[PDB]
Amino acid sequence: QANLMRLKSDLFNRSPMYPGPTKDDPLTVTLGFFLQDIVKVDSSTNEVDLVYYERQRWKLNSLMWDPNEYGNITDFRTSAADIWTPDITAASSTRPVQVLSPQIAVVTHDGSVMFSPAQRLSFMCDPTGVDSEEGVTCAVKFESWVYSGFEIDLKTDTDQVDLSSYYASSKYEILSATQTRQVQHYSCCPEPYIDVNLVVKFRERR
Amino acid sequence: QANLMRLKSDLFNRSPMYPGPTKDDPLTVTLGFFLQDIVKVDSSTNEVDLVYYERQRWKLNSLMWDPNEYGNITDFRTSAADIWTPDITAASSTRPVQVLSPQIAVVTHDGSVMFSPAQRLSFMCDPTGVDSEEGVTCAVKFESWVYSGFEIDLKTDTDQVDLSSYYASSKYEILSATQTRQVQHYSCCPEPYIDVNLVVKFRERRA
Amino acid sequence: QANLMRLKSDLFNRSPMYPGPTKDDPLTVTLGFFLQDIVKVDSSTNEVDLVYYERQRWKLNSLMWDPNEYGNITDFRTSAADIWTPDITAASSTRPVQVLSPQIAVVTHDGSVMFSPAQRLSFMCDPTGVDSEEGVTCAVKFESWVYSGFEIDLKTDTDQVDLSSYYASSKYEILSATQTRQVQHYSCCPEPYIDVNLVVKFRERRA
Amino acid sequence: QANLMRLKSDLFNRSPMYPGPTKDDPLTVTLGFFLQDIVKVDSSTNEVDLVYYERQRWKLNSLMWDPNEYGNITDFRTSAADIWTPDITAASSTRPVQVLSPQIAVVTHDGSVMFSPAQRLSFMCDPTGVDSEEGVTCAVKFESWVYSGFEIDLKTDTDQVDLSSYYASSKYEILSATQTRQVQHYSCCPEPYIDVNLVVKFRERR
Amino acid sequence: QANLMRLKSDLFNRSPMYPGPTKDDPLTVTLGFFLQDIVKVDSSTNEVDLVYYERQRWKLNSLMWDPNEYGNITDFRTSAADIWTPDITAASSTRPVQVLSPQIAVVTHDGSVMFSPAQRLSFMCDPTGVDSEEGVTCAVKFESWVYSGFEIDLKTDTDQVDLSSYYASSKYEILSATQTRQVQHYSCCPEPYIDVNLVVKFRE
Ligand SMILES: O=C1C[C@@H]2OCC=C3CN4CC[C@]56c7ccccc7N1[C@H]5[C@H]2[C@H]3C[C@H]46
Ligand SMILES: O=C1C[C@@H]2OCC=C3CN4CC[C@]56c7ccccc7N1[C@H]5[C@H]2[C@H]3C[C@H]46
Ligand SMILES: O=C1C[C@@H]2OCC=C3CN4CC[C@]56c7ccccc7N1[C@H]5[C@H]2[C@H]3C[C@H]46
Ligand SMILES: O=C1C[C@@H]2OCC=C3CN4CC[C@]56c7ccccc7N1[C@H]5[C@H]2[C@H]3C[C@H]46
Ligand SMILES: O=C1C[C@@H]2OCC=C3CN4CC[C@]56c7ccccc7N1[C@H]5[C@H]2[C@H]3C[C@H]46
């Protein structure tokens, strides 16, 4: 109790808040998707609704501490409002993302943070061919909304999207699921933009 | 009035807030479901909507007091924001859980807390066979979202889900309702995770 | 301005907030429903949507003052967040209650408070027979969620639900509307629980 | 910049907030509706959805200033949170009113305020006869929720509801639109209550 | 870290907040739409749902700084609550606009700001003829809600609405997309009101 209370007090009340990465001190942030259900497909609109955990990991020095000065406490939990989180956003969404879990993060003595919100996303997807045997493929970039490759680097830990939480009797069956880092420049803008393309080939169960 | 005001002042204003369990001082939390209606079933999506109370009980020493120093007050009510509550969450939900009751808890002189939110949940469930006589069975884990078996232990008081509040003329009729503790490890993460699996066999009303 | 500003400052800034009733100083709270429309009926789910004002009245000594010390001010208005309100809740709801009015209360020099939120409620109700001439009857308890009969007593002023605000051309026509105090004990719990049962017999409009 | 900053500082930061009208210093508030679309009608429920601007004007002495002491500034804009606004409410609504515009007001040196929120309202209305040529008529009171005639007086500037913003190809066509002050007493309560009845006769487009 | 923290502290904590344009110091604000999907059409109501980024650019002197006094920092990111943003609003919407991106802006040493919210809008539109080959045309003004032409001037950078982000397999296909500045006066009232008319011809 009294240890962790002090630890938190030292980190949050007695700096000003971490104002997010610059070109000078860029930051690396690490995504991992965990598919759960393809809930719905709507062929009137080309909107598909998808449910998943999204594990985000990054590391900050303003969040380091020595376990020894604080009761051999290696890691704690905290409301994600108490800290800076990255602005990772689905570029092709059609409705604001619905949050399905608590907004709580896990900070570790080395300054690393893990934050794994559950979400229901509706995004742009032409689902015709979903009843066919070959299936249909759908994609959605996840990018920082305001930060370039110069300030935030995205990475996957792995190209495989973890289907271990995926619902056995979902109306739809996952053939392929890949999460792939990507760079682009755009004609608008000098800098490189990084994103993680989430790609899912799927079809109706039988 | 002036007694209870002091009691609350001593507990909340004059520590820092209880920052939740660690491996060192783990915490046991106790669930009991109280089914109420299976409101809807949707076979396009395999989404089922379910309504229930969820009684959570835990106990903290930072919440003990002596009735005698505080006007023989054995227990009080408080907004659930004034206190730490556990982060118990349906793992298979498809839409954010809707709260149907006040967010208010009951603290007792011995430091035990009871908090019993009403909720409407939509979760993943293939309902085909719900018109059959044998029915269809559906499940949903309830787990802490950030805390392992090392920090929070879940338990049921009983394997029977209390159907006493269940709606007589619900469109669906409950055949079986079980709430069962469970342990797993997952490949992501070193520690064990506890959960309470809620399992409900049900089917359309008839005679 | 400057009188009422002082009055409010004395009441809210210079006590603690009223920490709600105990067995020792129980509190009586008084409901009156004012039906407005039966908006919708859904026979797939047995959900009925109902719209109404709910007048709550209670009285507190921490809210007394002398009109003479404060500019002959007999009563003021305030956001319902500035004060304790009771946690009166529909026990059989299926979706979170939608608020239709401002959350504002009226406090009076004698310490009595009046608070009359408009609301749209969906609750459990089998509406089959609503097209028949005899109609169909529907009920829903309104209870405090965390407080027993020992801490909060509910009462109606009257068994008649006020239909004066009820919509002339509602899709449904009200045959009976009653608000009836009630006591129960349950096997779960030692104490008595009070509630106000709202009961409404109704059917489709004709010519 | 620097003038208006001072003006605002003097008005908002260095009084207490205006705690709203009493019998002693009542207040007059002035409504004007501007119909825009009758979006939908639902004959299962007798719910109609209507979209409009609602111009509210009132005047306060706590908001007067001399243009000369403040850079000849006659009027400014401000978030409607920075000031008291009246609690004008549709008495027969069936779902909470959806706000379609910014919450911003206009204050003038004489202490008058103008605030014109756009809104989508669902209210109680039997629409049968809406396909007929004669149409169907619908009403909704707009009242202060907690303030009587003794504390707040409502008035229209005009009995005509301004149809100039109304949508040409709305599914429904407006035959009559009137906004009419009204007094009632109600059996619960001693005082008079003022309201502005909005009445709209309308029918399906040819 | 500690540089940018100081920069922000000097700008926001140690002035009053920029209280927005007056006739005296008017402000020019620059819109550019980036269409993305026409998601839905509803011919019962004459409501169409449209998804897009909306790039807003303006410039303030209260936001200038010298890169040299602040660690050669040329530009930073900030929550759009920390700063004044313009109140640009769709005049014909039928439901409150849904926000699809973070509410975050980009401020630059010269005092210019860029803020590019993603949005899903439902607005008034008769879509009959959308299955025809000629298509159907729909429009919606975007205006400041409380500010006249005297206080805020809108401009497009270009009459072409950028369709580069538009979804290949959208249910609807864009024939024309134009963003056009506009003035209107009203007989009641002395001032001009500026708006940017967004106009989109499209079909199945
Ligand atoms: O339309 C664009 C093009 C480009 O798309 C790739 C992703 C990017 C990340 N964010 C999301 C919004 C965006 C932006 C800002 C200002 C105008 C248009 C605009 N976008 C994207 C842009 C980059 C940068 C930025
Ligand atoms: O990969 C998973 C699945 C697994 O689900 C069982 C319960 C758990 C408790 N929380 C919920 C989120 C979760 C987690 C953390 C980081 C990445 C993925 C992820 N999840 C669950 C996981 C455990 C651990 C943790
Ligand atoms: O299952 C019930 C029904 C019973 O209803 C009478 C009123 C009561 C007051 N509160 C509201 C929630 C409730 C409660 C707590 C824990 C498990 C079940 C449960 N409820 C109600 C109950 C009592 C006690 C308590
Ligand atoms: O009894 C009622 C109905 C009536 O509705 C029309 C307008 C009014 C303005 N406010 C809204 C709440 C109300 C009120 C206060 C206390 C008990 C009942 C009650 N209501 C409305 C009433 C008036 C007065 C007051
Ligand atoms: O009815 C109108 C139309 C007119 O539209 C051009 C742009 C304007 C900007 N804002 C948006 C709301 C509006 C307004 C306020 C109060 C009553 C009517 C009204 N509107 C618009 C008006 C102007 C001014 C103002």
Author numbering:
A (entry chain D), D (entry chain A): 20 to 225
B (entry chain C), C (entry chain B): 20 to 226
E (entry chain E): 20 to 223
From the paper:
Protein-engineering methods have been exploited to produce a surrogate system for the extracellular neurotransmitter-binding site of a heteromeric human ligand-gated ion channel, the glycine receptor. Acetylcholine-binding protein is a highly conserved ortholog of the pLGIC extracellular ligand-binding domain (ECD) with properties similar to nAChR. Mutations affecting key residues in the orthosteric agonist site at the α1(−)/β(+) interface affect the potency of both activation by glycine and inhibition by strychnine. We therefore set out to generate a high-fidelity surrogate of this α1(−)/β(+) orthosteric binding site using the 2α1:3β stoich­iometry [Fig. 1(a)] by exploiting protein-engineering methods and the thermal stability of acetylcholine-binding protein from Aplysia californica (AcAChBP). Ultimately, the highly stable AcAChBP framework has allowed us to introduce nine amino-acid substitutions that have resulted in a stable surrogate for a heteromeric neurotransmitter site that binds glycine.
Variant II therefore reverted back to Trp164, but with the inclusion of a G162E substitution. The residues now changed (Thr53, Gln74, Tyr110, Ile135 and Gly162) correspond to Phe72, Arg93, Ala146, Ser157 and Glu202 in the human GlyR-α1(−)/β(+) orthosteric site [Figs. 1(b) and 2]. Crystal structures of variant II with HEPES, tropisetron and strychnine revealed that the G162E substitution was accommodated with the structure essentially unperturbed compared with variant I, although now incorporating two charged residues (Arg74 and Glu162) to polarize the binding site such that the principal side is negatively charged and the complementary side is positive. The incorporation of the inter-strand hydrogen bond between Trp164 and Ile135 is likely to support this recovery of thermal stability.
